[PDB]
Amino acid sequence: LHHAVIPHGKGGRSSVSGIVATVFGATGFLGRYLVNHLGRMGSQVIVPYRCEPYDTMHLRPMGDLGQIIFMDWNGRDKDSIRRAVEHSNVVINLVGREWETKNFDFEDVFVKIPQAIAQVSKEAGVEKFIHISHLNADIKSSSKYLRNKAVGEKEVRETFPEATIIKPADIFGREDRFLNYFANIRWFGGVPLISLGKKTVKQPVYIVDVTKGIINAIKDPDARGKTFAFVGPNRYLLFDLVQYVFAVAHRPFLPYPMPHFAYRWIGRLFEISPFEPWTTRDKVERIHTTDRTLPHLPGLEDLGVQATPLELKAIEVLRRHRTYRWLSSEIEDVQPAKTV
Amino acid sequence: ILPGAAYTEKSATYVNTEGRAQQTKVAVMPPGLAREDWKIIRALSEIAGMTLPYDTLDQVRNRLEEVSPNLVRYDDVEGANYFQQASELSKLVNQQLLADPLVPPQLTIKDFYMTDSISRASQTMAKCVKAVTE
């Protein structure tokens, strides 16, 4: 092993971790906390960014001097990927879009770009690659997201035979689109569901648990080539989950059934703007998709991570949405939601 | 290969030729991933299911005092008595002296500068040998 990448120090900010990471999609939600958790070990983190540099500014206080290297990249560009991953020893792929745009469908984001990154990481000599797929990703799902992500899963597995594929089930956090989606349908008209949302089952996994799983996947040589399934400790129906969301935020709650006659058409009624979409038909088909149980896969128990449940962090998430009249409330006020 | 520590790189009890025990202090840490030697042997005893009854260096020194207690009393010469009993035990095995002369292998100035594992790896000692053999 090379003399500059030998791990030194007491594992703090100015230590050396022995990790040179290339974190694709680092300017989103998971890349935020991943660069935050890698920078406190002193890992030389290459951050490839596509967006404005200003939108990357919040990544700068996350490490020591020279421990985060920002560089431009494009998704359809082999040159930028080979320019970015040639010096690394772990390449984490967090590239995802919850919505398709004019320039990128789900096939570009989930099939083209991960196969390009995994192909270059094989043909440039990277020891560890890590890919992030969704737990409900299947070939014959009714959503474009899970179909393209399962096809990209199979491609990344077959073109890089040691790619650590990770399945987080459903991630909730501060800048998420899971609890922030369930809390930001309050003044639209009454939180629409299908058959009152008691037909689909979820288990939300907490983002610090997923990030510590990614850290322990970088650390563990036994974790090469596996397919990890990160899930939370408690399974919930969607109906009592949304009960708990509107009961932590202390909000009015009058749900109604909106059937398949017109709740896929409220996509093309409610993304008539070309901006960042509030909902879409893929979001409808994924929120109303149950979380499949895969007990044979190794999970957060098999990487030394205690999975933190929903109730200990939902107040930390959803304090933002209370008006004023119960900002001085507690966690010991709301009764915890029913598990299944 | 298990990489070890040097003499400048570990707190370390040595003995001179007169029985005086002394200890070094850590000038620099050992380079790379190389650890201190008894730390390595104790970790090997932990892996092999034969865990030695110490964790820290002072407990190693208490073990050392159990084995021979003059090795925890630094900069103190203890007078070893009882030459008579060793003399009487030397009268048993009458080994025959050879006729070959007692010639030490360090005859010249060339034989000094390269003796042990450190002095052979020095470019300065190489310049000394190159300078005294020209």
């Binding site: 500059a4 020279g66 290297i69 320019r83 | -």
Partner: protein
């Protein structure tokens, strides 16, 4: 007098250039390794040896109070020129 490594990186006058597998070339990806190109050891070789006629010469680097402190150089060695300790200049007794 700058030469170039087989990796594709310039060489300083100290002699430092990174390995092919050292990750710390990634700070130069998309940027440039600002090295100097006026090497002092190659610029002091262009100075001709000052032919003087004394035995002890006094060198101060020129300028008077703007050079190095004034030292004295013995020149009795005819095989070796008398190199100044500070400025790198060198003198020669011509006889």
């Amino acid at each position: 007098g700058v030469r170039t490594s087989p990796t594709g990186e310039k060489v300083t006058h100290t002699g430092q250039v990174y390995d092919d597998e050292d990750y710390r070339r990634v700070r130069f990806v998309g940027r440039q390794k600002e090295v100097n190109e006026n090497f002092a050891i190659d610029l002091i070789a262009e100075q001709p040896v000052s032919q003087v006629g004394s035995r002890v010469i006094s060198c101060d680097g020129g300028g008077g109070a703007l050079g190095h402190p004034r030292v004295y150089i013995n020149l009795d060695k005819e095989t070796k020129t008398g190199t100044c300790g500070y400025c790198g200049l060198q003198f020669r007794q011509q006889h």
